[PDB]
């Protein structure tokens, strides 16, 4: 969340601590994302910053074109793979972690989205919602 955060999101269970690697869901040519920080996270002794669905993270690419390696960039998580409770009462989860590359304002670097996205993330970033195929 942060600059591009249009609206507020209810709390959802954290499933992506720093050091986690997730798949790239866009067509920018990255294969995976390496988490190094989470925007808007608090501070505590020995508590690893953790990411959730729809949170903006500071991420790094380990596999992809060399133009994307060796440099940090913002990212937005689109699939969690850890069950979280929506306020309608349902627990839901995808089968894998996934994110996309975006600028600090939330404009996605890529142009298309592969696979479904979480409704919590789509409702919060309009640009991600625009390029998303299936939203749940």
């Amino acid at each position: 969340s942060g600059n591009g955060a249009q609206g507020t999101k209810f709390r959802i269970s954290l499933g992506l601590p720093v050091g986690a690697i997730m798949n790239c869901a866009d067509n920018s040519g990255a294969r995976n994302l390496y988490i190094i920080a989470v925007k808007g996270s608090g501070s505590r002794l020995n508590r690893l910053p953790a990411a959730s669905l729809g949170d903006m993270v500071m991420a790094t690419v380990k596999k992809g074109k060399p133009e994307l390696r060796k440099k940090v960039m913002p990212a937005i998580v689109v699939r969690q793979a850890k069950s979280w409770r929506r306020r309608d009462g349902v627990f839901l989860y995808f089968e894998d972690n996934a994110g996309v590359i975006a600028n600090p304002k939330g404009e996605m670097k890529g142009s298309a989205i592969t696979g479904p996205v979480g409704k919590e993330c789509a409702d919060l970033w309009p640009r991600v919602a625009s390029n998303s195929g299936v939203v749940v």
């Binding site: 309608d88 627990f91 839901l92 989860y93 995808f94 089968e95 696979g115 749940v136």
Partner: protein, 67 residues
């Protein structure tokens, strides 16, 4: 509200019960409990498990509804 139908066992799912699973191909599978979900994770065929509604319908058990 609307009461869900289990994707595996067909059992009725009331609000706040069970777990919902979205597969990478965007298809959604709702499991009423941990048992059905775990069996699904083992690639078990619902038609081979003796207590699922699909098995009972395919084996004509308690099928006195349609004449």
């Amino acid at each position: 509200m609307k009461v869900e139908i289990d994707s595996f066992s067909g059992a009725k799912i009331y609000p706040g019960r069970g777990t919902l699973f979205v597969r990478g191909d965007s298809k959604i599978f709702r499991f009423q409990n941990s048992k059905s979900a775990s069996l699904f994770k083992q690639r078990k065929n619902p038609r081979r498990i003796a207590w699922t509604v699909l098995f009972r319908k395919h084996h004509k058990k308690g099928i006195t509804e349609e004449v």
